[PDB]
Amino acid sequence: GAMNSSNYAELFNNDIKLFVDDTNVYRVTVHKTFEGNVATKAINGCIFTLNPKTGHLFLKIIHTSVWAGQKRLSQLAKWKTAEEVSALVRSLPKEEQPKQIIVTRKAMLDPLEVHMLDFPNIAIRPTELRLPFSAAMSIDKLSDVVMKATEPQMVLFNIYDDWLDRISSYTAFSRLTLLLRALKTNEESAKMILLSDPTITIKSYHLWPSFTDEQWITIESQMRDLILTEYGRKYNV
Amino acid sequence: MNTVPFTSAPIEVTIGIDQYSFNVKENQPFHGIKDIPIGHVHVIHFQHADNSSMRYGYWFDCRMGNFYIQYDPKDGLYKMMEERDGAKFENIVHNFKERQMMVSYPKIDEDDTWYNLTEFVQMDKIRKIVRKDENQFSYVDSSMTTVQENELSDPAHSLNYTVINFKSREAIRPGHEMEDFLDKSYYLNTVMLQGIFKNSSNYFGELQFAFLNAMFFGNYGSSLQWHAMIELICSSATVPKHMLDKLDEILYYQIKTLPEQYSDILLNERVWNICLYSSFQKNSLHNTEKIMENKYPELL
């Protein structure tokens, strides 16, 4: 059934699984028309499909042309997310196909289930976890490849960079969710924490800075403080 | 007007005939039901006074043979049997009528209720849902499971309703996932009407038979089937106008007949709210919407 705090270790076992987040598929700016009505203009989006064990990210870029002359776009966006995940699974060799797909939003269940009818042994699960994958587009290199796309494109990343060389997938996921939670709560302050020190760079082939083990502890502490500092403002507590 | 004689009533029982019912006392000199209207199916049904567990009954058509009821003290129920000897049967019925040992099917001349509930129900379709080809009449009870309930355990005792499943390859054409899921017209019109039922009359027969089994036996699988066949039409954008008009009439008489006190168990909130207020056909069921709003406003 639902993935929660109770069954959290299951994310790091040897059963292939993928998180699917559809938050950034259909993205708009709302603006005024010359007549003083309101209109939306779509921008490029992405499906965020992540193997939490390996860090492998299947970033499917959703080009604005998808939406041209379509109606009920927030509804279509769930079905298009499901079409593209189903197509990804069918493209993978059998031994690479997931056993489970966990959707971060319950509205993706029926669309994904219907598109995956050909795969009755792949479980489609919701989660009770509130994962911060919406903040994916706060990661500069992911944001850049999405906005520059001129056509539908699939880009493959490791969202853990080379972390699994030094830490477990449990710890790598904890680090990723803390970074994304911070970027989601206060993007400016999170980016300042990550790039404030000029001597620490991001490798051409990486998403995040090249931090030593001790620098990661400091960064992780600064991220926790940011999230509490911000929660201190929100609620005045 | 045909007759179903009873050998005797050795156990205290509530006897149903169609929408009517009578309490019979233990060893009361009851010998059956006369004046049963020719031209419809009928259902004769039972609920023992000493064990209300297992409502059970028999669907029959008096045109297909001479049928009687006899209590079996071994299996502990009223059984239907066919009398093949025409002259023995007529002779038995004539005797019981003379001694006025039979209740009269109590049909008011103005009242089309039974016709309206069974308009599309045919014995030959019942005998394919309820498989026991040695008998011309069909046994149903409270506890019998459907083929679909059994998939999700004795095949011989199943209700073989047509399986309907909105998240099945049968319901969803490869490459038309969103279209077929949001608009079930393909599934209704091509798969079910043209494909399996052949026509709207057979589809309505099964819908009406599922309802009556749900109402008279509290058969939960039957109730699921009735709701599924309503939802499949209401969730289709493209339905022939004659089918919508007929559905409105069918559902109106089902809601009209339903005991007021069973609406909590026999009506599915989600299906009715969706069908009347959100679906493609929300504005196509005027009679059904007015009786539901006036009789069961809490459900909605």
Side-chain angles (χ1 to χ4, degrees), chain A residues 19-36:
Chain A
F19 279 114
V20 170
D21 183 87
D22 68 318
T23 301
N24 287 309
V25 170
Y26 176 45
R27 300 210 282 164
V28 297
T29 51
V30 180
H31 64 89
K32 280 293 194 65
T33 70
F34 175 82
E35 297 81 16

Side-chain angles (χ1 to χ4, degrees), chain B residues 31 39 43 88 111 132 134 137 142 149 163 170 182 227 234 238 245 250 260 274-275 294:
Chain B
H31 292 293
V43 59
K88 185 181 178 192
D111 169 54
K132 195 168 199 213
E134 64 264 42
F137 51 83
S142 281
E149 277 178 312
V163 176
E170 290 73 25
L182 287 181
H227 282 96
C234 290
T238 311
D245 285 342
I250 288 167
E260 300 72 44
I274 279 41
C275 287
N294 279 278

Side-chain angles (χ1 to χ4, degrees), chain A residues 191-199 219 222:
Chain A
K191 289 192 192 212
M192 285 168 70
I193 290 169
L194 283 167
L195 325 176
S196 65
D197 175 359
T199 71
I219 292 302
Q222 284 171 347

Side-chain angles (χ1 to χ4, degrees), chain B residues 82-151 154-251:
Chain B
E82 176 174 0
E83 180 54 79
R84 68 161 292 115
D85 184 354
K88 185 181 178 192
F89 187 80
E90 288 169 25
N91 188 255
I92 285 296
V93 164
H94 178 266
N95 178 85
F96 287 152
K97 275 190 192 176
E98 275 291 279
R99 301 203 306 140
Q100 294 192 37
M101 294 276 95
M102 305 196 150
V103 296
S104 173
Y105 188 95
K107 199 198 165 286
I108 293 319
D109 307 276
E110 172 186 56
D111 169 54
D112 266 347
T113 291
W114 193 245
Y115 172 74
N116 290 327
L117 295 168
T118 63
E119 181 174 356
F120 301 101
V121 184
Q122 314 178 295
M123 258 327 296
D124 69 302
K125 294 309 192 308
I126 293 181
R127 291 178 80 233
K128 295 177 202 306
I129 299 166
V130 192
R131 304 194 161 289
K132 195 168 199 213
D133 291 332
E134 64 264 42
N135 297 330
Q136 296 285 300
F137 51 83
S138 297
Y139 174 89
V140 182
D141 70 23
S142 281
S143 72
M144 278 162 61
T145 55
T146 70
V147 166
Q148 174 172 67
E149 277 178 312
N150 291 161
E151 289 170 358
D154 180 60
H157 214 62
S158 285
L159 294 169
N160 304 274
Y161 291 123
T162 292
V163 176
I164 294 171
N165 173 1
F166 298 136
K167 298 192 285 185
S168 74
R169 174 55 64 225
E170 290 73 25
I172 305 289
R173 282 169 299 172
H176 305 247
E177 285 85 4
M178 183 184 195
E179 166 183 15
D180 285 356
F181 186 71
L182 287 181
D183 178 6
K184 317 210 184 278
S185 300
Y186 142 73
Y187 191 33
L188 173 66
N189 290 303
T190 299
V191 176
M192 290 282 162
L193 290 178
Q194 178 184 266
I196 297 182
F197 287 100
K198 305 310 176 181
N199 58 56
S200 63
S201 295
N202 294 338
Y203 184 99
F204 289 142
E206 178 164 332
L207 184 158
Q208 292 184 307
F209 182 57
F211 175 71
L212 294 167
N213 286 324
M215 183 172 61
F216 287 130
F217 304 115
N219 184 270
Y220 178 76
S222 287
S223 185
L224 289 185
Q225 181 72 11
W226 176 52
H227 282 96
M229 301 189 74
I230 295 168
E231 190 167 5
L232 175 60
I233 292 172
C234 290
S235 305
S236 302
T238 311
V239 184
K241 316 84 157 65
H242 78 273
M243 267 189 76
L244 293 175
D245 285 342
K246 189 65 62 165
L247 183 60
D248 193 25
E249 291 302 314
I250 288 167
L251 294 180

Side-chain angles (χ1 to χ4, degrees), chain A residues 166-232:
Chain A
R166 303 194 69 85
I167 64 180
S168 65
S169 64
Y170 179 111
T171 300
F173 195 76
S174 300
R175 182 180 291 167
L176 171 68
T177 55
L178 172 62
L179 287 169
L180 289 174
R181 181 55 70 208
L183 284 166
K184 191 165 175 174
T185 316
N186 195 318
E187 182 183 32
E188 182 222 341
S189 296
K191 289 192 192 212
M192 285 168 70
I193 290 169
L194 283 167
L195 325 176
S196 65
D197 175 359
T199 71
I200 323 172
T201 65
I202 306 173
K203 294 287 151 309
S204 57
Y205 50 87
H206 281 172
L207 294 182
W208 310 96
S210 293
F211 287 128
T212 63
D213 296 7
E214 292 314 303
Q215 280 170 346
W216 268 125
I217 305 293
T218 308
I219 292 302
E220 285 167 345
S221 321
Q222 284 171 347
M223 291 303 183
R224 276 187 300 270
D225 288 338
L226 176 161
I227 294 159
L228 294 189
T229 289
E230 277 316 314
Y231 173 102

Side-chain angles (χ1 to χ4, degrees), chain B residues 51-68:
Chain B
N51 176 9
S52 48
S53 294
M54 191 178 43
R55 273 184 268 167
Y56 61 99
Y58 307 84
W59 290 94
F60 68 93
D61 183 338
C62 279
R63 288 174 294 184
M64 286 159 73
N66 298 317
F67 306 112
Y68 67 102

Side-chain angles (χ1 to χ4, degrees), chain A residues 72 75-76 79 90 110 113-115 117-118, chain B residues 166-169 172 174 177-179 181-182:
Chain A
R72 289 191 60 80
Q75 180 187 68
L76 177 60
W79 293 87
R90 294 173 211 271
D110 281 345
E113 173 163 12
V114 166
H115 269 280
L117 289 171
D118 286 338
Chain B
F166 298 136
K167 298 192 285 185
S168 74
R169 174 55 64 225
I172 305 289
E177 285 85 4
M178 183 184 195
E179 166 183 15
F181 186 71
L182 287 181

